[PDB]
Amino acid sequence: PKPINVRVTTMDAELEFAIQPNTTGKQLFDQVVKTIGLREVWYFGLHYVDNKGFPTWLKLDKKVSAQEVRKENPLQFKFRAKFYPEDVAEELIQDITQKLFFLQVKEGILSDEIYCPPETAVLLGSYAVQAKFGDYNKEVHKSGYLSSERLIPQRVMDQHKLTRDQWEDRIQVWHAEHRGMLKDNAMLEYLKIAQDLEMYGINYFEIKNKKGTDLWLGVDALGLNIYEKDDKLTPKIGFPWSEIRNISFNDKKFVIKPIDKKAPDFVFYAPRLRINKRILQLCMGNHELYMRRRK
Numbered sequence: 001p002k003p004i005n006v007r008v009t010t011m012d013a014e015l016e017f018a019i020q021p022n023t024t025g026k027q028l029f030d031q032v033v034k035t036i037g038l039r040e041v042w043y044f045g046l047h048y049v050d051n052k053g054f055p056t057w058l059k060l061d062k063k064v065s066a067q068e069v070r071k072e073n074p075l076q077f078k079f080r081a082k083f084y085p086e087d088v089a090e091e092l093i094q095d096i097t098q099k100l101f102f103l104q105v106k107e108g109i110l111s112d113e114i115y116c117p118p119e120t121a122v123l124l125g126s127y128a129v130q131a132k133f134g135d136y137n138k139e140v141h142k143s144g145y146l147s148s149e150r151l152i153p154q155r156v157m158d159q160h161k162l163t164r165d166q167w168e169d170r171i172q173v174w175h176a177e178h179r180g181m182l183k184d185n186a187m188l189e190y191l192k193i194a195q196d197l198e199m200y201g202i203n204y205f206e207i208k209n210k211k212g213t214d215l216w217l218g219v220d221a222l223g224l225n226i227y228e229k230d231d232k233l234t235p236k237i238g239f240p241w242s243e244i245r246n247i248s249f250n251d252k253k254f255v256i257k258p259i260d261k262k263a264p265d266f267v268f269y270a271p272r273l274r275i276n277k278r279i280l281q282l283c284m285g286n287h288e289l290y291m292r293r294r295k
Contacts, residue, residue: 004065005074008032008046011103016074019064026060032079040097042289045082048075054274057082057281080104083285084201086221086293088191095184102131102187105194112155114199115233122167124193125151126174131186136176146171198233203282205275207254207268217268219282221290224256226266239266241290249280 003018006028015035019028025046033041046058049070058077059067069075081104085091092098106128108114109121116124129149133141146168157167178186194200202218202225209215216232218225223244225235239256246257252273256266270276 006064006077007074008077008079010036010079011100011107021063021065023064024060025058025062025064025067028058028064028077029060036096038094038096038100040093043081043083043085043097043101044079046077046079048077057278082282083289084221086290088195089188091293098184098187098191102191105191105200109194109197110150110153112153114194114197116153116156116194116197118156118160120193120197121152121156122170123174124190125171126178127186127190127193129171129175130178130181131183131190133175134183135179135181136172141172141175144168204232205270205279207270209269210267215268217270217279219279219286221286223286223290224283226268237266241287244287247280247283249276252276254279 001020001022004020004023005016005018008015008028010032013036015032017031019031029041029044029046032046033039033044038044047055048058048067050056051068051070053070056067058064058069064075081101084101088098088101092101105114106124109116109124129146129151132149133145144165151171152167157164162170181189202220204227205217205219207215207217207226214229215236216227216229218227218232218235223238223240223242225239226237227233227235239258243259243263244256245259248255248257252269252271254268254270254276256268258265270279
């Protein structure tokens with residue numbers, strides 16, 4: 001039948017090939033991972049922009065052609081991590097997987113999505129520089145060698161009095177300390193530091209309690225967190241996956257039901273059904289992976 005042209009990018013590559021009207025999301029996903037030689041498939045998914053302009057995750061047990069992908073030639077998909085390990089250093093197996101996590105997390109730090117304090121930004125940048133440039137080399141890494149790099153999150157640059165040049169100098173000092181460090185190990189060290197950031201690995205959603213107070217829900221590899229609207233850093237209430245019997249989803253509502261029956265149910269409301277559906281998907285996926293690491 002009539003071929004459908006698609007294009008899939010990962011953090012550092014683009015793939016372009018054709019699929020058929022009957023091709024399922026799983027079949028497309030399978031073609032992608034096999035092409036790049038990635039086997040740790042449980043972390044990843046394909047997202048696309050729907051016909052209304054909303055980023056959406058591709059459903060694997062459904063025809064690609066049946067999912068309202070923005071109609072264009074080629075269809076555009078991004079292959080990205082949807083789930084994060086609990087500890088990158090002990091769980092990730094392949095260099096490719098580790099690289100794609102490094103690139104994706106670094107993107108979120110450099111875009112200011114993931115709050116990073118200044119000294120951490122400098123340490124992180126030093127590993128990214130070691131990964132990209134290799135060992136510091138006086139001979140070729142002369143002043144301004146970091147001039148065209150996005151090194152530091154803009155919000156960090158903005159809340160301080162240092163200049164671009166001075167940030168570079170701080171990174172260079174740390175870059176010099178990493179001498180001999182192989183690229184894959186620099187990426188791993190980067191991820192070990194980022195993992196410790198308070199906003200790392202969390203999807204945030206606007207929600208309200210029954211009182212109508214505006215809050216945030218965070219969903220991550222470890223469980224659920226409830227935050228006050230003005231502070232995404234420090235949870236007010238935490239619900240580890242180990243402590244959750246069930247999360248019921250009814251229309252716009254959610255109800256977190258504890259394993260400990262002596263604890264009460266916690267009820268929340270999300271503003272749009274679209275968002276609620278995605279909360280459900282992330283809860284399901286993270287809970288499922290949580291069980292695996294333990295058994």
